[PDB]
Design a protein around this ligand. Structure first.
Ligand SMILES: CCCCCCCCCCCCCC(=O)OC[C@H](COP(=O)(O)OCC(O)COP(=O)(O)OC[C@@H](COC(=O)CCCCCCCCCCCCC)OC(=O)CCCCCCCCCCCCC)OC(=O)CCCCCCCCCCCCC
Ligand SMILES: CCCCCCCCCCCCCC(=O)OC[C@H](COP(=O)(O)OCC(O)COP(=O)(O)OC[C@@H](COC(=O)CCCCCCCCCCCCC)OC(=O)CCCCCCCCCCCCC)OC(=O)CCCCCCCCCCCCC
Ligand code: BCL
Ligand SMILES: CC[C@H]1c2cc3[nH]c4c(c3C)C(=O)[C@H](C(=O)OC)c4c3nc(cc4[nH]c(cc(n2)[C@@H]1C)c(C(C)=O)c4C)[C@@H](C)[C@@H]3CCC(=O)OC/C=C(\C)CCC[C@H](C)CCC[C@H](C)CCCC(C)C
Ligand SMILES: COC(C)(C)C/C=C/C(C)=C/C=C/C(C=O)=C/C=C/C(C)=C/C=C/C=C(C)/C=C/C=C(\C)CC/C=C(C)/C=C/C=C(\C)C(=O)O
Ligand SMILES: COC(C)(C)C/C=C/C(C)=C/C=C/C(C=O)=C/C=C/C(C)=C/C=C/C=C(C)/C=C/C=C(\C)CC/C=C(C)/C=C/C=C(\C)C(=O)O
Ligand SMILES: COC(C)(C)C/C=C/C(C)=C/C=C/C(C=O)=C/C=C/C(C)=C/C=C/C=C(C)/C=C/C=C(\C)CC/C=C(C)/C=C/C=C(\C)C(=O)O
Ligand SMILES: COC(C)(C)C/C=C/C(C)=C/C=C/C(C=O)=C/C=C/C(C)=C/C=C/C=C(C)/C=C/C=C(\C)CC/C=C(C)/C=C/C=C(\C)C(=O)O
Ligand SMILES: COC(C)(C)C/C=C/C(C)=C/C=C/C(C=O)=C/C=C/C(C)=C/C=C/C=C(C)/C=C/C=C(\C)CC/C=C(C)/C=C/C=C(\C)C(=O)O
Ligand SMILES: COC(C)(C)C/C=C/C(C)=C/C=C/C(C=O)=C/C=C/C(C)=C/C=C/C=C(C)/C=C/C=C(\C)CC/C=C(C)/C=C/C=C(\C)C(=O)O
Ligand SMILES: COC(C)(C)C/C=C/C(C)=C/C=C/C(C)=C/C=C/C(C)=C/C=C\C=C(C)\C=C\C=C(C)\C=C\C=C(C)\C=C\CC(C)(C)OC
Ligand SMILES: [Fe+3]
Lengths: 271, 38, 50, 335, 69, 60, 56, 56, 38, 38, 52, 38, 56, 38, 56, 38, 55
């Protein structure tokens, strides 16, 4: 099945690895070399997640938890019973996340597009890599990563946040939250703006680009561009993930005490 | 839209509003018999 | 408590934040701020003879 | 070297400022003429144009400034009117809610009356701003999607009034302060047993992350086809060009399914709205239906098992029993 | 008067009414939070029985559990 | 009753609302490029493609 | 009465009905949340046995 | 006096006035409900001598 | 709206205003008998 | 707005303002009789 | 009077009314928050009984 | 604005400021008798 | 020395000058208000001998 | 803005500045009599 | 006097007044924050009675 | 913009800098006699 | 000399004054935060009475 305009776009070329062997479509999906690599890592990682569930006490979806090894194993590959299975799944996830990004770059190259989508996705991958690779390496043990469980990884976030007695006082966390909140507000504004022009008051014609700019100047005194809003949305969403990666990588590797005590520098200014 | 349309609608709006208030008054009378609030 | 007695102003905190003692005062040692932390004692003009 | 990433604008045009589409000016008017910012034109549109002011806007500004003044003056009085301490300690200062024993009755002025007055004025200002947004939308014959998107956030904001009223005390309200409202957030989660196990809280987390994911995806997609004219979304919606086709095809080949140039904005709208809607429901159920979300999660099979880290003997079980927190001591005893 | 030539009466009236509304609400709310003029609770008291000199920054206990609702 | 509580009822009402909303948005997603072309003939997923939507333009 | 010439009856009916429905739900919910008029549980009590507020 | 309707549109003034009165009525009713003396839903059956009075 | 139209509206407005205030005066007098606030 | 229109508005505005202040002064007299603040 | 040619009277008088309103509010608030001049509660006290 | 208009506006502005300051002066003298601050 | 008014716009200088003077006056007034010695709202009636002095 | 206009504005600015400082000097003199700071 | 040909006097004057004003406030505020020179409180002390910092 | 008018500016700028520094020298001498910092 | 041909004197002057101003503030503030050279508090002490680091 193809869209009514899809046939003329399904051409060869644009791949980073391979030729006509991996230049086909399986149903709607495009399969490249990195499509094949994605399926390998997804299948291996998911099957090992199912095995970790079978080793545990329950099949309940919310209660399944595959935990990282103890801190005493210290950057080694622990026994698979004792957390080594978590490390293997982590490698499969890294390979699948990397393959997904490279597969996206191949698709945009075939369509004559920019490379923005792979790099925007790389912000999320960087945050994940900080959580399970960079910060655990700086702290010296793979056991500093979070467990793989729907509600188990919420317990990790709670306990890690309270390792600094008040995680709200983290300066980088405060900035990252502002990025997340502003992004949600801007997305609601952008979604409303396009829909209100395209679906206007009943019986009236569809509005124009002037209508958007006039409306937001009337409301706020300033109207970002049609390209400005898409630049801002990319900046807010990706910057939220980048500031999240900073906020967690400075807790422990750089700051070990409580986060409220960090604000001594502001209170001890000479003035 | 016109004067005659306004008069016809007004007649039904007035009867509908007043009849609704009388039915609510009877409901308050029944509620008073059950558990008065003053 | 079954009853409440009003404390002296010098024993009353100006700041009503619950966590102010552990988040700010435990790290603040400025003497001016420590002085501002509480209300000051008061009297009457008749008590002073004015 | 690298291609043009459409991240900034190097050549900016200047014309006469856009005065604006003619609108009804009986109860309001446009102020200013429209200036141009060179720094703002690099990122988006350069015009710092005229702003419309009417009945609802003026009233909203008056009420909001009254609330802001009350909050700031109470903050300043809390440091003894010291300007140096006011700036130095500004993140830690607060306008605190009333004491718990007053319930919903009127507190003293210095012990929560200012708080309630400022909250009332802020609520009136927010509602008047909603009215202003609605009128601005319908003056240009636009649909009212932004008013209802704003109403969702107003609903979440108003749960911070309705939950304390449902539990029966204004002491449970959010203090006005930078660090203090975070303190309230933490203590509210602790008091009601780990808000991570509130299902509507998890739902709002999912919609917040989904909003970030959707905006990253849409922004990257539009910037990737901006050289084909994809940033003119209204045209690509009423007359589908090759930029919309390429966006659709990219996402269909990547994911197996796609949206249109119009419906991706519906996705965005609904994710952003559902964030605050589910959050407001979750806050409303806390302390009124469920008093311990961890125990509710245990009830409904949400809590993963861990090995016990301690065990207690029966005498230890009786001794380690504590007391619920009560009143502060109003006397200084002598021993 | 020529002041209405400089300032449009339509614009001034809305600002004037809004200022009066906020000021009247502020004063009524301040009196409601005071001990001497909390007329909804103590309006029936005579002038001699009304509270006097009750500034008392810690007039009431700050820490306590919620009332038994 | 005992096991059934308000939070669970509200959660399931939200689930039904979300599924309905997803169906509506998926219907809106199929307003361009449909019906699909396949060798076996025309194809539509669930939900089915909606009716043709026409816009309104200002006169010249 | 010429109020309908300057006010659209269709919008008035929708706003009025919406206001009445929300008001009725609020009043019914306030009574249900109270002690004296929690009629789902205590509706069979007579007026003498119904809860009364604290007397001073 | 009637010339105020030439300066101000009756449609806008009436809608604003109804919104102001509705909010004012709700605020006053709610303030009385939250008080001790006039929480009429619970203690409305008390006599004037039995109703709560604020401390002297 | 003409000057004559403004005159006709003003007559209905003062009557509606007066009728609203009078009914509120009865409500306040009824509340005073039940529970005086002074 | 013409000078005559400003003159007509000013007369009503001044009378309305002063009358409003007088009504507020009577309210302050009634409040003072009930519970003086000085 | 020649100052009114240099500055627009409309903007000057709006900024003057706004500045004085905030100043009056700030001063009345400071006195209300003080002990000596909390006139809502202390107003009937004589000067000898007022707090110092 | 013209010079003839600036003269006429300056008269009302000075008289308005003069009256406002005099009312403030009377208010301060009233407050000083009631509760002096020095 | 009057030539500075061609280098700098008199209108912009007066606005900037008044704004800086107003902010400075408020800061000095409030610095004194928060001090023990110069509160003057609570302790203004004290004589200079009775006014507080910082510790030696 | 010509030289003569700069001459006219400078005369009022200097007089206003020197007059303002003298008034502030008298204010400091009164404050010194009440509570000296040295 | 030839510096003013290389450097524009208008922006130099603004940067000089801006820097000196900020520097003056910083020094005044640093002294006000100290114990020896907290002149608002202890300005009436003699040089002998003024506080001195910790010694070895 | 030229040498001739820059020389006129320099005379007022230098005399202003000298006057500012001289007042600061008097201020520091006053502060030294009141409470020396060395 | 020929360095002003390679570098604009106006750009050099601004960068140099900005660097020197920052360096002087950093050194003055580092000494102010120390114990031996907290001159605003202990400047009247003689060199023998000034604080010295341990050992
Ligand atoms: C929320 C509401 C909506 C929720 C839902 C949202 C859905 C979103 C997506 C929308 C589209 C879905 C439909 C779709 O994808 O259809 C594809 C296909 C039609 O494909 P086609 O158009 O005929 O194919 C075109 C083209 O590829 C023709 O090539 P050819 O015909 O030569 O195919 C060669 C392929 C296939 O040969 C194989 O052997 C692949 C078999 C894959 C499935 C079985 C897996 C297990 C055995 C593995 C092999 C064993 C040895 C043979 O050969 C290839 O190599 C193709 C690429 C395969 C992937 C890359 C290589 C990976 C290698 C490493 C990993 C190996 C496996 C671990 O049609 C169907 O399969 C019909 C059924 C579709 C509905 C799904 C039914 C699922 C049932 C099971 C559900 C289980 C739930 C847990
Ligand atoms: C607490 C405060 C919170 C926070 C506050 C929450 C407040 C409520 C929010 C509700 C959602 C609003 C969504 C939205 O886009 O709003 C903007 C729109 C702007 O419309 P407009 O400016 O008046 O005019 C624009 C209009 O011409 C085009 O609008 P657009 O197309 O963008 O979206 C409006 C409609 C789509 O319109 C159509 O489909 C009409 C096309 C022609 C007729 C269709 C064929 C005939 C059908 C006949 C049978 C059908 C007849 C209806 O979109 C929507 O209304 C949203 C639809 C998706 C959401 C519902 C999905 C299903 C949910 C139930 C699932 C159940 C389980 C399976 O404003 C509106 O009011 C739209 C109309 C809303 C209709 C539903 C109202 C429901 C009220 C429920 C409570 C009533 C009191 C008890
Ligand atoms: C220890 C702390 C607790 C916790 C306690 C809470 C509490 C308590 C709440 C949340 C809520 C939220 N939390 Mg949580 N939260 C925790 C951990 C997390 C984590 C994480 C990394 O683990 C994440 C991602 C989140 C994320 C979120 C959001 C999804 C959600 C708020 C939505 C929103 O947009 O709010 C921002 C949006 C608004 C506030 C909307 C209203 C905005 C108004 C209209 C703005 C008016 C401004 C005015 C005009 C200007 C200022 C005026 C001046 C004041 C005068 N929480 C832990 C478990 N969280 C909320 C929620 O819904 O929970 C169910 C909530 O109340
Ligand atoms: C979909 C949910 C998200 C959402 C949506 C949303 N918010 C919205 C909207 C929408 C769709 C609007 O239409 C509306 C709007 O107009 O946005 C531009 C709004 C809005 N969201 C706002 C804020 C906001 N939204 C938030 C969150 C969210 N908004 C959600 C994440 C938050 C958070 C995270 O807490 C905040 C703080 C406002 C910008 C605006 C509503 C404006 C409003 O109601 O204003 C009332 C007016 C006042 C309070 C007056 C204030 C007066 C000044 C404080 C005094 C000025 C003094 C002096 C002149 C200057 C002093 C400077 C200092 C103050 C810096
Ligand atoms: C403690 O609790 C708190 C809450 C705190 C206390 C507070 C309480 C408060 C503030 C309450 C306020 C109450 C209030 C006022 O504000 C309440 C106001 C109520 C009112 C006015 C109700 C009016 C109802 C009117 C109705 C039902 C009319 C129906 C019309 C009908 C049936 C006719 C339709 C038929 C037609 C048209 C025929 C077609 C004609 C055609 C086609 C033609 O004409 O051609
Ligand atoms: C708890 O402590 C706190 C709360 C803090 C204490 C504080 C309290 C405060 C500050 C209170 C403020 C109160 C206040 C403010 O001034 C109150 C002001 C009240 C006022 C003015 C009310 C006015 C009401 C007027 C009404 C209802 C008029 C209705 C008219 C109608 C229906 C006319 C219909 C006929 C028409 C339309 C003709 C058809 C058209 C025709 C023919 C045509 O077009 O031809
Ligand atoms: C802690 O304690 C704190 C609270 C801080 C202590 C507080 C301190 C402070 C700072 C208090 C401030 C008080 C204040 C500020 O100045 C008070 C100032 C009050 C003022 C100015 C009130 C003025 C009211 C004016 C009114 C009501 C006018 C009405 C006019 C009418 C009805 C006529 C219009 C109708 C017309 C024209 C129709 C003809 C049209 C025609 C012919 C046409 O259109 O052609
Ligand atoms: C701890 O700190 C704390 C304790 C806070 C210490 C704080 C200290 C401080 C820093 C205090 C500051 C005080 C201050 C200065 O700075 C205060 C400054 C006060 C001043 C200047 C007040 C001036 C008011 C002037 C008024 C009201 C004028 C009104 C004029 C009117 C009405 C006429 C209108 C015009 C007309 C009618 C013309 C018609 C049109 C015509 C003819 C035409 O169009 O032609
Ligand atoms: C711990 O405490 C801390 C605070 C930390 C310690 C720190 C202290 C610090 C740093 C203090 C700094 C103080 C300072 C800075 O230098 C102080 C500097 C003060 C100065 C210079 C004030 C100058 C005021 C000038 C005024 C008022 C002029 C008024 C002129 C008028 C009215 C004339 C109007 C013009 C007309 C009418 C023209 C008509 C138009 C015409 C003719 C035309 O048409 O052209
Ligand atoms: C621990 O404590 C910490 C704080 C850390 C330790 C600190 C350390 C540091 C780094 C200190 C730095 C100090 C410093 C740096 O060098 C200090 C540098 C000070 C300097 C340079 C001051 C110079 C002042 C000069 C002035 C004010 C001149 C004004 C001139 C005027 C008004 C006249 C203009 C008018 C004209 C011309 C009109 C004619 C127009 C004409 C003809 C025309 O229009 O054409
Ligand atoms: C010189 O400076 C001045 C003082 C002049 C001005 C400066 C001001 C400054 C610096 C102000 C600073 C303000 C800051 C830092 C504010 C911070 C605000 C924050 C972080 C707020 C965060 C959360 C607050 C929330 C969520 C509050 C919600 C409150 C609600 C919903 C209250 C509702 C209350 C109602 C509806 C009350 C009704 C009254 C009645 C009597 C009807 O019911 C009790
Ligand atoms: Fe978009």
């Amino acid at each position: 099945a193809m869209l009514s305009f899809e046939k003329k776009y399904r051409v060869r070329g644009g791949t980073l690895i391979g030729g006509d062997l991996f230049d086909f479509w399986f149903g709607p999906f495009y399969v490249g070399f990195f499509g094949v690599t994605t399926i390998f890592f997804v299948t291996l990682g998911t099957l090992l997640c199912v095995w970790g569930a079978a080793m545990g006490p329950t099949w309940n979806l919310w209660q399944i938890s595959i935990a990282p090894p103890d801190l005493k194993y210290g950057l080694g590959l622990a026994p698979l019973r004792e957390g080594g299975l978590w490390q293997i799944i982590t490698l499969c996830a890294l390979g699948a996340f990397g393959s997904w990004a490279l597969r996206q770059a191949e698709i945009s190259r075939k369509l004559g597009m920019g490379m923005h989508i792979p790099w925007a996705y790389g912000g999320a991958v960087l945050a994940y890599a900080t959580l399970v690779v960079i910060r655990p390496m700086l702290l010296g043990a793979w056991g500093h990563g979070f467990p793989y469980g729907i509600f188990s990884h919420l317990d990790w976030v709670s306990n890690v946040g309270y390792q600094y007695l008040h995680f709200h006082y983290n300066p980088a966390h405060m900035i990252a939250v502002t990025f997340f909140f502003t992004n949600c507000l801007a997305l609601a504004m952008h979604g409303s703006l396009i829909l209100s022009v395209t679906n206007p008051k009943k019986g009236t014609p569809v509005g124009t680009s002037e209508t958007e700019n006039v409306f937001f100047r009337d409301l706020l005194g300033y109207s970002i561009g049609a390209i400005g809003i898409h630049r801002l949305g990319l900046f807010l969403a990706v910057g939220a993930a980048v500031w999240s990666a900073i906020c967690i990588v400075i807790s422990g590797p750089f700051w070990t005490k409580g986060w409220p005590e960090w604000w001594n520098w502001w209170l001890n200014l000479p003035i | 839209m016109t004067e005659d349309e306004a008069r016809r609608f007004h007649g039904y709006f007035v009867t509908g509003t007043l009849g609704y208030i009388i039915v609510a008054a009877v409901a308050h009378f029944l509620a008073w018999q059950w558990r008065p609030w003053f | 408590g079954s009853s409440y007695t009003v404390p002296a102003p010098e024993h009353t905190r100006r700041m009503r934040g619950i966590m102010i003692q552990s988040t700010l005062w435990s790290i603040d040692g400025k003497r001016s701020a420590r002085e501002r932390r509480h209300y000051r004692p008061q009297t009457t003009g008749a008590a002073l003879g004015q | 070297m690298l291609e043009y990433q459409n991240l900034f604008t190097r050549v900016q045009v200047r014309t006469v400022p856009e005065a604006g589409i003619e609108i009804d000016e009986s109860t309001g008017t446009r102020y200013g003429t429209g200036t141009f910012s060179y720094l703002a034109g690099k990122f988006g549109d350069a015009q710092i144009g005229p702003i419309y002011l009417g009945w609802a806007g003026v009233l909203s500004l008056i009420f909001g400034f009254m609330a802001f003044e009350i909050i700031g003056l109470n903050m300043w009085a809390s440091v003894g009117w010291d300007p140096v301490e006011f700036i130095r300690q500004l993140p830690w200062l607060a306008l605190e809610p009333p004491p718990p024993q007053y319930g919903l009755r009127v507190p003293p002025l210095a012990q929560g009356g200012w708080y309630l007055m400022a909250g009332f004025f802020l609520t009136i200002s927010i509602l008047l701003w909603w009215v202003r947004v609605y009128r601005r939308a319908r003056a240009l014959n636009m649909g009212t999607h932004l008013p209802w998107a704003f109403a969702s956030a107003i609903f979440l904001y108003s749960t911070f009034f309705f939950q304390p009223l449902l539990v029966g005390s204004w002491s449970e309200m959010v203090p006005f302060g930078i660090f203090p409202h975070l303190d309230w957030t933490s203590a509210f989660s602790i008091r009601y047993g780990n808000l991570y196990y509130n299902p509507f809280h998890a739902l709002s987390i999912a919609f917040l992350y989904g909003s970030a994911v959707l905006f990253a995806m849409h922004g990257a997609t539009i910037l990737a086809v901006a050289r084909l004219g994809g940033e003119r979304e209204i045209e690509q919606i009423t007359d589908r060009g090759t930029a919309a086709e390429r966006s659709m095809l990219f996402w269909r080949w990547t994911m197996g399914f796609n949206a249109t140039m119009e419906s991706i904005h519906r996705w965005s709208w609904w994710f952003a709205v559902l964030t605050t809607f589910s959050g407001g429901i979750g806050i409303l159920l806390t302390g009124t239906v469920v008093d311990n979300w961890y125990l509710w999660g245990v009830k409904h099979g949400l809590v993963a098992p861990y090995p016990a880290q301690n065990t207690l003997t029966e005498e230890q079980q009786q001794l380690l029993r504590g007391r619920y927190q009560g009143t502060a001591p109003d006397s200084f005893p002598s021993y | 008067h020529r002041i209405w030539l400089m300032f449009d009466p339509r614009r001034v009236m809305v600002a004037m009414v809004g200022f009066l509304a906020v000021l009247a609400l502020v004063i009524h709310f301040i009196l409601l939070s005071s001990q001497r003029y909390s007329w909804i609770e103590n309006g029936t008291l005579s002038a001699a029985q009304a509270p006097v000199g009750a500034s008392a920054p810690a007039a009431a206990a700050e820490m306590s559990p919620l009332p038994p609702g | 009753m005992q096991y059934i509580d308000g939070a669970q009822i509200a959660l399931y009402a939200f689930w039904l609302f979300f599924f309905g909303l997803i169906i509506y948005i998926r219907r809106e997603d199929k307003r361009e490029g449909y019906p699909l072309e396949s060798p076996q003939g025309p194809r539509e997923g669930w939900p089915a493609m909606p009716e043709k939507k026409t816009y309104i333009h200002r006169p010249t």
